Structure formats: C-alpha cells, structure tokens
Amino acid sequence: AEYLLAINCGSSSIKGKLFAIPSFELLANLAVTNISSSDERVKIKTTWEEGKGKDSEEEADYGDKIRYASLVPILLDHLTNSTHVKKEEIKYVCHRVVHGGMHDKGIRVVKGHEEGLMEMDKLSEFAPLHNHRAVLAVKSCIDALPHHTSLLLFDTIFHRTIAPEVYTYALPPPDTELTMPLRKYGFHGLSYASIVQSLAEHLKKPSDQINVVVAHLGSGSSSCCIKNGKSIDTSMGLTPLEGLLGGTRSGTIDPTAIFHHTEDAASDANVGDFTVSKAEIILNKNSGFKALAGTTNFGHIIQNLDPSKCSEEDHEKAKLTYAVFLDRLLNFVAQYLFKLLSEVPIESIDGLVFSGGIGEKGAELRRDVLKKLAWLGAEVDEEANNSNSGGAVKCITKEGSKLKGWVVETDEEGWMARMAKEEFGFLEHHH
Amino acid sequence: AEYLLAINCGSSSIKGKLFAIPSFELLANLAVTNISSSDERVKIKTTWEEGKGKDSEEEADYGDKIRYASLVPILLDHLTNSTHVKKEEIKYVCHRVVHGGMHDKGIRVVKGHEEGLMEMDKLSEFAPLHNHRAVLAVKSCIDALPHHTSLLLFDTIFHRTIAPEVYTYALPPPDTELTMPLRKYGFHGLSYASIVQSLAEHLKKPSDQINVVVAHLGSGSSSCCIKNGKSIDTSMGLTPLEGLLGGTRSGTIDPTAIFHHTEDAASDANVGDFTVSKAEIILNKNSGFKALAGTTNFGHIIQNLDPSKCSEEDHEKAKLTYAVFLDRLLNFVAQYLFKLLSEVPIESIDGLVFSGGIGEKGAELRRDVLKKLAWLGAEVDEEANNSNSGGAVKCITKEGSKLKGWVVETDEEGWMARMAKEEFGFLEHH
Numbered sequence: 001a002e003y004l005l006a007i008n009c010g011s012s013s014i015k016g017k018l019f020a021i022p023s024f025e026l027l028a029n030l031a032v033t034n035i036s037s038s039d040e041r042v043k044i045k046t047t048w049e050e051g052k053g054k055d056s057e058e059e060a061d062y063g064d065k066i067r068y069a070s071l072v073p074i075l076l077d078h079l080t081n082s083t084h085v086k087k088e089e090i091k092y093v094c095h096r097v098v099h100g101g102m103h104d105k106g107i108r109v110v111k112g113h114e115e116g117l118m119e120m121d122k123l124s125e126f127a128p129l130h131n132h133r134a135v136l137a138v139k140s141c142i143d144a145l146p147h148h149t150s151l152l153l154f155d156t157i158f159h160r161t162i163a164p165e166v167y168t169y170a171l172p173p174p175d176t177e178l179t180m181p182l183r184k185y186g187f188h189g190l191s192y193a194s195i196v197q198s199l200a201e202h203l204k205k206p207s208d209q210i211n212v213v214v215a216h217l218g219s220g221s222s223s224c225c226i227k228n229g230k231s232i233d234t235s236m237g238l239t240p241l242e243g244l245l246g247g248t249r250s251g252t253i254d255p256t257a258i259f260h261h262t263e264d265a266a267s268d269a270n271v272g273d274f275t276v277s278k279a280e281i282i283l284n285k286n287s288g289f290k291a292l293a294g295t296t297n298f299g300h301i302i303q304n305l306d307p308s309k310c311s312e313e314d315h316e317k318a319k320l321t322y323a324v325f326l327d328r329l330l331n332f333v334a335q336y337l338f339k340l341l342s343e344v345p346i347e348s349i350d351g352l353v354f355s356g357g358i359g360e361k362g363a364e365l366r367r368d369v370l371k372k373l374a375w376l377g378a379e380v381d382e383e384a385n386n387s388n389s390g391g392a393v394k395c396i397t398k399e400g401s402k403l404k405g406w407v408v409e410t411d412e413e414g415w416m417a418r419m420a421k422e423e424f425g426f427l428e429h430h431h
Numbered sequence: 432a433e434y435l436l437a438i439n440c441g442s443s444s445i446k447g448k449l450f451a452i453p454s455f456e457l458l459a460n461l462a463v464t465n466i467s468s469s470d471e472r473v474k475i476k477t478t479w480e481e482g483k484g485k486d487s488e489e490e491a492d493y494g495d496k497i498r499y500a501s502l503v504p505i506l507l508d509h510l511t512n513s514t515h516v517k518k519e520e521i522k523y524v525c526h527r528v529v530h531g532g533m534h535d536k537g538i539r540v541v542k543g544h545e546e547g548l549m550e551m552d553k554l555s556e557f558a559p560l561h562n563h564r565a566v567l568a569v570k571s572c573i574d575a576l577p578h579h580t581s582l583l584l585f586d587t588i589f590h591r592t593i594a595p596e597v598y599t600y601a602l603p604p605p606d607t608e609l610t611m612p613l614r615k616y617g618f619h620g621l622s623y624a625s626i627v628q629s630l631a632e633h634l635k636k637p638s639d640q641i642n643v644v645v646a647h648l649g650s651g652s653s654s655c656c657i658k659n660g661k662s663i664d665t666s667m668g669l670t671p672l673e674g675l676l677g678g679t680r681s682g683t684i685d686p687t688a689i690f691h692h693t694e695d696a697a698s699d700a701n702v703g704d705f706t707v708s709k710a711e712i713i714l715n716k717n718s719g720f721k722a723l724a725g726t727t728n729f730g731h732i733i734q735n736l737d738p739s740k741c742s743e744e745d746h747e748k749a750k751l752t753y754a755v756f757l758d759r760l761l762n763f764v765a766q767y768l769f770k771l772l773s774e775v776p777i778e779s780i781d782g783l784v785f786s787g788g789i790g791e792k793g794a795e796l797r798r799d800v801l802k803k804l805a806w807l808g809a810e811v812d813e814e815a816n817n818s819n820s821g822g823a824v825k826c827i828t829k830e831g832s833k834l835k836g837w838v839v840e841t842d843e844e845g846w847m848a849r850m851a852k853e854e855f856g857f858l859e860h861h
Binding site: 126164165166168169170171172174175176178182184237238239241242245249250251252253254255256257258259260261262263264265266267277279280282283286287288289290291292320321323324326327330331334335337338339341342345372373374375 | 557595596597599600601602603605606607609613615668669670672673676681682683684685686687688689690691692693694695696697698708710711713714717718719720721722723751752754755757758761762765766768769770772773776777803804805806
C-alpha cells in the first residue's frame with residue numbers, strides 16, 4: 001500500500017488530497033481549518049469517496065495556540081491513528097509553494113539531500129509572506145516522514161513561457177546579489193494549468209490548441225492570457241500583490257504611495273517570525289476589500305449592493321468596492337483579449353473563463369463583465385449564468401455568442417498529483 | 432503694453448511663450464533644450480516674431496552638470512533684452528506645475544501673499560521630484576518681477592472628472608493626515624486638454640463631442656481615455672511614476688519590488704536640496720530606458736533597432752526596450768479603447784491620437800501600434816504617416832480605416848494662456 005499526499009498550505013486553512021499509488025486514484029479530501037483563530041478551535045476533517053474511508057472530524061487547540069510547524073504533523077497523526085493509513089505508506093507529498101522563481105519544474109526535497117533543502121530555504125527567504133508556511137510544512141513533513149520524497153510545485157511554473165518584453169522590469173541592478181531577478185513571475189499557475197486542461201478535455205482538443213483569457217478570482221485574484229495552451233501574460237508581477245486587489249491586498253498602486261501612507265515603510269514589521277517590511281504587511285494584509293468595504297468576503301459585498309441588507313454606509317462601500325474590482329478586472333480582460341485578438345480571430349478563441357472562489361460564485365460579476373463585452377459579441381445566458389446546473393466546465397453565454405464564456409472549477413491538488421505522476425516516472429513506456 | 436509669459440519647466444527642456452494681452456499676439460518663443468543630456472550642452476534659444484526683437488541663442492554647461500534653477504532667470508534676461516519688452520510690462524506669468532492634487536483650477540501666487548505661497552509649498556513638498564523645479568521658477572519670477580502675478584496651472588486639472596471607481600486606491604487610512612488623498616491623479620492634463628481642443632477644431636465639432644484614446648509619448652509618457660471631451664481614465668496614478676516606463680522612470684512594477692532592490696529604501700536619499708526617499712530617486716531617476724537600454728533617448732533606441740547602426744549588445748538592448756515600451760503602451764491603448772467601445776460604436780469614436788515628443792516623431796512606433804489594431808479595422812496610411820506636410824492635426828490612417836489615427840501637436844503654453852485668460856478675465860473689447 002502506497003499513497004501520495006498533496007497539500008496546499010494557506011494562512012487560514014490547509015487543504016489536501018490523498019491519492020493511491022501507483023493508481024493515482026483520489027481517496028480522500030483533507031482540511032485543516034481555523035488556523036489563525038484565537039477563538040475557534042482548529043478543525044481537522046477527512047472526507048473519503050464512495051468506499052475509501054469513514055469520515056471523521058478532529059478538534060485541536062485554538063488556532064492561536066498552535067505553531068504552524070505543528071499543523072501538518074497534527075494532520076498526519078489524525079490520518080494515521082484515526083484511519084487505515086500508515087505514515088511509512090506515504091511515499092510522496094506534493095506541496096503548493098507560491099513563488100518558484102526561475103524554476104521550470106518542481107523540486108524534490110529528500111531528507112539529507114542538501115540541494116533541495118537549500119533551494120527551498122532561498123525561496124522561503126526571498127518571498128516569506130507567500131512561501132513561509134509553504135516551506136514550513138515541507139520541513140515538518142521531512143521530520144515526521146523521514147523516508148518520503150517531498151515535491152514542491154510552484155505557481156510560477158505555468159508562466160515560465162512569458163516573453164522578456166512582457167516580464168521585464170525596467171530597474172537598474174539591485175544593491176546586492178539577489179536569489180532571483182526582479183521581474184514579473186505570475187502566479188496561480190496550478191489553477192491556470194488545471195483550467196486549460198479541463199477546458200481542453202471538455203472541448204475534446206489538445207491543450208496546446210487552447211486560446212483563452214482566464215480571470216481566476218478569489219481572496220487573491222489574477223488574470224492570464226493563454227495562447228496555444230501557454231501563459232503569455234498575467235496580471236501578477238514580482239509577487240502576488242501586483243495586479244488586481246484582493247481580500248486584503250491592494251493590487252497595483254503607485255510604487256511610491258506606501259512611502260506617503262506609512263512612515264519608515266521599509267522597516268521591519270515585527271509581526272510574525274520572519275522579517276518583512278511594514279510596507280509588505282500593509283499592502284498584503286491591510287488593504288484590498290478589507291480596507292474598502294470592511295470585509296474580505298466578496299459575496300457579502302455583492303449582497304450589500306442591495307441597500308436593504310445593510311446600512312447606507314455599508315451599501316455605499318459595497319458599491320464602491322464592487323465597482324473598483326470590476327474596473328480593475330475589466331482592465332486586464334481588455335489587455336488580454338486585445339493581446340489574443342491581435343493575432344487570432346474571436347472565432348478561434350475558446351473564450352473567457354471565470355474561476356476561483358469569486359469566479360465560481362459571483363454570477364453578478366460575470367454578468368457585468370460579459371455585458372461590457374457586448375461590443376465584441378458576447379451575450380450572457382442569464383439562466384445558465386444564474387443557475388446551479390453543474391459541470392466542472394460550464395458555458396454561461398448564449399449559443400450564438402461570438403465570445404464564449406465559461407465557469408471552470410479548479411482542482412489544484414489534483415493537478416499537483418498529475419504533475420507528480422509525470423515527475424516520478426509513472427508515464428514512462430520505454431522499449 | 433502688457434504681457435503674459437507662459438513657462439513650462441520640464442526635466443528635459445523648458446518651453447515658454449510671451450504673449451501681448453489681451454490680444455494674445457505671440458511675441459516670442461523660448462526654448463531650453465538638452466537639460467538631461469550628457470554629450471550635448473544645454474542650448475538656450477529665444478526666437479522673436481517679426482519686429483519684436485533679435486533672435487538669440489546661447490550655450491551653457493552640459494545638462495547633467497547644469498544648475499537647473501539658473502535657467503529661468505536667463506530666459507527672463509533674454510526677454511527684457513528686446514527694445515520692445517521691459518520687466519514692468521510682464522504682468523502675468525503662467526507656470527506648468529505637474530501635481531496640483533485636488534485643485535480644480537490654478538493658484539495665484541503674488542509676492543507678499545501668504546495664501547498662494549503656502550499652498551504652492553504644500554504641493555512642492557508633497558511631490559518634490561515633479562514640482563520642485565517649477566516652484567523654483569516661480570520664486571525666480573517673484574524675485575525678478577516683484578509686481579507680477581504668477582498663476583500655477585496643474586497637469587492634474589484635466590483629470591478631475593475621473594470617477595471614484597477608477598481613481599480609488601484600495602489602501603487603509605494613512606498613518607497621519609496627509610495633504611491630499613492617496614489616489615490616482617493623472618497628469619499631462621494641459622497636453623490632453625490642448626489635444627482635445629485641436630482635434631475638435633480640426634473636425635469642426637464641439638470639444639464635448641470628442642471620444643478618443645490619446646497616447647502622449649515622450650520622456651514621460653502616458654495615455655488617456657477621453658469621452659465627451661473629458662478624461663475618464665489615464666495611465667499615471669498618484670505620481671507620474673505609475674504606468675508607462677520613461678527615460679529614467681520604471682513605470683508600473685510590484686510595489687514591493689523596490690524593497691528587495693535596495694536596502695533602507697524609505698530613507699532620505701540625501702541628494703540635491705529636498706527630502707526624498709532612495710526609492711523615489713531610484714524609480715524616477717535611475718530606471719526606465721536608462722536602465723534597460725543605457726540611454727534616455729527613445730530616438731536612439733529606435734535607431735538601434737537596425738543592427739548595422741550599433742554594437743550587438745546595444746542592438747539587443749534596444750530591441751528589448753522598444754518591445755517593452757510597445758507592450759506596455761498597447762496594454763493601455765487596449766484598456767482605453769475597450770473602455771470607450773463598451774459604450775459607443777467604433778464608428779463614433781474620433782480614434783487614436785499620438786502626441787508628445789516621441790508620439791510626433793515615431794512614425795515606426797505609430798505604425799507598429801496600428802498594426803496590432805488590425806483586428807479592429809485600423810489601417811495605417813504609410814504616406815500620410817510619414818508626411819511632414821505640417822499642421823497641428825494630421826490623419827495617419829487610410830480612408831477605409833474603421834479606426835482613425837491621428838498625430839496632434841500639443842501646445843501646452845498656448846493652453847496655459849487660454850486658462851490664464853479665463854482666470855484673470857482678459858478679453859479685448861469691441
């Protein structure tokens with residue numbers, strides 16, 4: 001018996017999937033929730049499929065009393081001394097690490113092997129706001145599972161194809177040798193890759209023939225221009241901060257604004273364990289929907305566009321926040337449609353895809369975007385767009401729409417398992 | 432006799448015009464060129480309209496070596512050397528000031544009046560890299576012309592119509608109360624206002640019927656979406672740094688980039704005579720074309736697209752820099768055309784306007800931009816695109832083009848004079 005665990009470590013939750021090896025058959029969904037909280041207790045839940053395992057929930061300490069480094073081992077204990085799976089049976093663990101710098105492929109991390117471990121530390125150090133936990137979880141696994149191989153899969157990988165004229169930052173050399181160049185990297189690559197593959201299968205054509213604009217919208221939001229199945233531009237830059245605003249992030253603003261906003265902006269924030277500037281905290285954790293609307297929940301913002309569900313003040317903040325998000329989003333959809341349409345006709349593009357937490361649930365947002373593209377021939381299908389009629393790939397435009405619109409469910413952890421299948425040789429058919 | 436002087440202090444050049452009032456007869460052009468250049472000396476040229484004085488031209492030190500604040504006084508000196516102009520006759524001076532914050536109109540500045548001086552100082556200390564040079568020009572005018580009135584006219588005025596959903600930065604309240612909100616302001620407004628009026632006149636229709644996207648391209652470049660004659664969006668944000676990269680400016684990059692790039696980025700750069708962060712210095716003076724191509728001159732970059740004209744390395748840098756600039760420019764042209772087209776048919780937009788130093792000269796750049804717009808039905812007219820026929824407004828697209836393309840020559844000093852007229856109430860009677 002052998003398993004692959006694929007995990008995705010966020011600030012407020014860890015999501016994971018357990019796969020059977022060498023089958024790569026999905027066995028379980030795992031979730032660790034309430035990670036931040038001082039009030040609610042960390043919950044750990046497993047959810048098998050059909051007949052793979054008996055569900056079981058586990059409540060640990062309040063989130064603020066658990067070190068992040070202890071979560072995965074708690075999760076691992078829960079897996080073993082509550083189900084049929086043994087630690088020594090976990091041969092592989094895939095980790096979503098946001099920032100992979102210049103890496104074209106995932107990195108193996110194996111106990112004792114200095115290279116993978118040192119590279120992982122350099123990535124963690126370069127972008128700790130984004131990679132910290134990502135690296136912490138890996139370190140904990142190395143400790144708890146001494147004989148497994150960890151595979152780091154990066155959200156930057158999908159964007160390694162972007163050309164120099166797109167990624168270049170017009171800056172002089174830095175004052176010191178850095179771990180990686182300062183340039184646009186781009187993120188959400190595991191989602192974009194997954195989306196292209198789902199759409200290609202749905203349309204029954206290879207992914208290298210997919211031409212699409214994707215708006216992957218959630219607590220972090222971005223958009224990507226995909227030509228022949230490959231990223232050619234995306235809205236995020238050196239870090240996930242750039243581009244669209246998010247639950248708590250500002251998105252693109254004048255690079256000098258923060259110096260006005262906050263004194264000693266380059267100084268250490270003295271929050272958390274790792275060193276990070278006050279500027280990076282404010283821009284990533286105190287901005288975005290939180291600063292504009294009082295909530296990080298975009299669905300709550302969409303509700304409050306109805307002035308009967310809130311005070312006049314919250315209705316007005318919701319109106320503004322919604323309009324800002326839509327405006328910034330239309331900007332990128334415009335850039336990316338333009339960039340595709342400059343080379344290929346609208347008939348030859350597979351369309352506009354919405355994904356992410358907001359992309360899947362925000363029917364109003366999708367309708368407003370699609371109305372704005374009426375001049376290009378997009379026509380929303382109001383029922384399809386508004387109904388809960390399923391499918392991981394769902395059309396939301398009318399049959400005669402000259403631009404096709406879709407909602408696509410991402411499966412990042414599933415994608416990581418697919419990458420690991422290739423990585424560990426399970427696709428080799430030599431002679 | 433009374434005159435109005437309109438002065439436009441840039442980092443690359445100073446331009447001015449002297450006008451008789453209330454007639455607004457042009458009497459002199461003033462030009463200081465090569466101000467940022469390392470191998471050409473600053474040239475100071477005064478050119479008189481027929482009858483008013485003797486054209487005068489003079490050379491000063493290299494641009495990278497010159498004391499900027501010495502320039503305006505030399506200009507004033509050239510003006511009063513005419514037998515037709517005395518200092519006492521120069522009653523008004525109009526100044527282009529980049530950042531006017533929330534002001535809806537210009538600010539009068541008079542020697543001995545605390546109101547104007549104070550406000551000018553608040554704007555200069557909010558954005559000294561963009562305003563300090565013009566403010567020094569104002570003090571030079573006060574010193575030399577104790578009885579004149581200065582009027583500061585802001586690049587931000589044209590963009591006061593932009594909607595909250597466009598200008599809002601998703602930031603929390605700042606840590607202190609600031610001079611003005613942190614939001615998108617937008618600049619080159621005197622140029623855009625001038626372009627709209629020029630195009631309106633050429634098309635023989637009111638400025639409020641103008642719907643265009645404008646790419647104002649030069650040392651600092653921006654783009655603007657204009658609907659019914661008004662700015663509804665524009666590429667620069669809180670400062671002219673945001674948006675397109677420029678001669679020495681990075682343009683839009685991840686706001687946290689500079690913190691990786693440079694230690695203690697928020698600290699005083701301690702250079703020149705005003706307080707400015709190392710970050711702001713790096714992003715504005717050491718980035719952009721300078722960093723990528725090793726030159727600030729986009730014309731040299733274009734020339735170097737031909738590999739026979741330069742080294743292999745300079746050819747490679749030029750190709751990249753040119754491609755970077757074109758990619759970023761097309762992003763905003765895309766945003767703004769989409770923004771207009773989302774409400775009006777393409778048949779009723781006046782089109783795409785090129786302006787600015789680079790926009791007027793870069794025939795090949797306009798060609799490359801229009802080629803990317805082929806899918807919309809844009810078609811360049813090679814002969815018209817290279818025409819030097821002359822005229823403030825020229826069409827560069829083919830009769831058949833679904834999207835009209837133009838080159839329009841800005842007259843910022845002339846626009847300032849128009850704004851002064853409305854401010855001070857000059858008009859000749861009968």
